[PDB]
């Protein structure tokens, strides 16, 4: 077996938790020896530890520089009842990203045989999603009745306290929230986006809504311009690429009619939403990579961008055949292992991480596919059961195809 | 000429302001006589009136129940320099939607001969965008340096204050903002969405992020469920349709791969962003309806959902040929006139509003179209100037076909 090194692993929930075991059992552990630091981020063990396991996992990623994460449940009211939880725990992803910081870079996994839903996307679209702040570290509450909601800033220095009226509720109640972001975090966000654009050789676009959030989003736009003009403007010219700020609604329209081949710097919320749209446009939520690259340049957290796929977990619980796509969870392992190999100049691990990705593509392009991708080719009404493999047949086929590729080399 | 009635009109900026005139002079007032109350909401007069023109127009819509609005400029810092304005004026749309409230219903305008960019959308997607609150009535500010940002609630009855920590900036500054929403507005939002689904015969989906905004977005989710179970669930089952809540990121993916045929209840921000994504998916940003339906059930504001097309306006300024799609601006008039005809039982005006929309569709499907629609057919690189009409020849042909349809 290859000696892989130290890797922080985080277990998830429902359908992805099951696929996670198959990946470890059929594709990884037979060929790689790892100092696997495992953290159960399943909903029950997060509840049992009062979510401390989530903060422990984040700290381990700081120590060992590589984390691979399975999709997890973020509970609302209906999940508190289903699992008898103590409280509505925050998203484990929000907690992990808030401790590490950085940019979540997402990108579709492309197969030559899979038609897109968007006709023009002949090149990849890479989304750089800011991983900090905004709605994912906000403080929201219900306004019970009439009253004023105000937002106040108290400076650390000589007091110049400022009180802003949010809304005076004259009758009835409602909702209110405050959210924030950090100058330093936005600077890291900008650097990560300019570097990625230059590294790939593609233009870079940043989307905000600064016409409406004039000071909030205007900070994002200004900091990108300043960093561009001071550190990156010349290297952009030398590579024959450009940087441009666009309104977010203009940007989604341009992306929809684009040919692809650009970097898309997104604020936290838009990066969430638009990365599922892009992934689905290219084929399936199961065909997309997601890597949190930290500002240190050395630490990464690879993950599946999709959720736990509970709707498929429901069918599995009623003993109905499931055809869930494991590729995004598999590429979380391979991308994490690839970065682990790059930190240690591990030749054998680099080759294994590439071979494991090559096996996924080669298998799909040969006609062996989960139902989601078979629907891309034939159209959902024209799909028969012969057109695809169930969840377990597909991972059986990847396990066989990987064993053969590794036996050959 | 037809006796149209009282209609509030709001002029806009740049390329849309040019197109707006052409519509009035070629397609409306030659055939309709209207008590037209015109408000110049262009950036020039909004500055001159200190945006009092925008508040005046919104008040006029409340009295006369029908407003038609041209696309306008929302100024950034970079447009304060271009016209040397007093301040960064707020969005006239936000101001108008805030005074009226309600839901902005958006839907693509379909033509037989125009391929989509999204393969599977064979049925219409209608987005119901909540028009009140959230980012569009928010208070944002720059955090200059280290300090504490808190949000407070003081009840009116004099009971105890509650303060929540937003963020303690230990080093450096950043940004912060507060935003809110109102129960009654959410209820009106929910009623309009269940009713529209029942009117169209399609299922209804609401998108929020209640796993993250547990109390803020949970309120939206809970109020829809309560209104569904108590008032609309039984009529839904009788019509073989349904309502379901979905997280926004799952929702945008489902919509992308769907066949269409559903109502999409969106919060203010998502309704903004996603309606331009859907419009571009079907063909072009200029082929989309946008109608603000107020909770009172009588007043309505139709608009062009797109922007002012400044890229074409720059070419227009530099004396270069343009090919801008006027149909969204044309439909704002027809939708406005149609509702005016519904309130006055004006059979003739009802017919005129439909004839004007049919002529637009019939024109494109006969092969006479703007460049954006020609690019949908041939692909933008393979489009020649013989493949399309410019902005002014296209509205010339619409004038001819509309006069012929009305005479016959
Ligand atoms: N990274 C994360 O940890 C993360 C991200 C998002 C959501 N979540 C959590 O996951 C739970 C479910 O959320 P959700 O259902 O809204 O999001 P989701 O699990 O990503 O959505 C599942 C739906 O999207 C499609 N889909 C997603 N992944 C797929 C795959 N690998 N193969 C085939 N189809 C796939 C399926 O649509 P069809 O039903 O049409 O097959 C499925 O029903 C929630 O509790 C949420 O908190 C976690
Ligand atoms: N409803 C409103 O009043 C509204 C909404 C949004 C923005 N705005 C304002 O508009 C100003 C700038 O405009 P924007 O950023 O929104 O740009 P935009 O008008 O969305 O135009 C962006 C691109 O979309 C295409 N496009 C849009 N409308 C079109 C039409 N009717 N026919 C053909 N092509 C069309 C053009 O594509 P090409 O690249 O092919 O030219 C154009 O370059 C902003 O200051 C903002 O305040 C107003």
Numbering used by the authors:
A (entry chain A): 4 to 412
B (entry chain B): 4 to 411
The authors write:
Isocitrate dehydrogenase (IDH) catalyses oxidative decarboxylation of isocitrate to α-ketoglutarate. NADP+-dependent IDHs are mainly located in mitochondria and cytoplasm, and play an essential role in cellular defences against oxidative damage as a source of NADPH. To investigate the effects of Cd2+ on IDH, we determined crystal structures of mcIDH alone and in the presence of 20 mM CdCl2 at 2.0 and 2.5 Å resolution, respectively. The structure consists of a homodimer in which each subunit comprises a large N-terminal Rossmann fold domain and a small C-terminal domain and β-hairpin clasp.
In the structure obtained by soaking a crystal in a solution containing Cd2+, strong electron density equating to a Cd2+ ion was found in the active site. This Cd2+ ion is coordinated by three carboxyl groups from aspartate residues, namely, D275 and D279 from one molecule, and D252 from the other protomer of the dimer. The guanidinium group of R109 and the carbonyl oxygen of A308 also participate in Cd2+ binding. In the active site, unexpected electron density was observed near the nicotinamide moiety of NADP+ that reaches the sixth position of the octahedral Cd2+ coordination. In the crystal structure of IDH soaked with Cd2+, another region of strong electron density was observed close to C245, with small areas of satellite density, indicating the presence of a second Cd2+. We placed a Cd2+ and two water molecules at this site, and the geometry of neighbouring atoms was found to be suitable for coordinating the putative Cd2+. Thus, interaction of Cd2+ with C245 was observed in the mcIDH crystal soaked in a solution containing Cd2+. In the crystal structure of the mcIDH–NADP+–Cd2+ complex, the cation is coordinated at the active site in the same way as Mn2+ or Mg2+. Because Cd2+ was coordinated with residues from both subunits, Cd2+ successfully brings the two subunits together to form a functional active site, as shown in the crystal structure. The crystal structure of mcIDH with Cd2+ reveals a closed conformation with an α-helical regulatory motif.
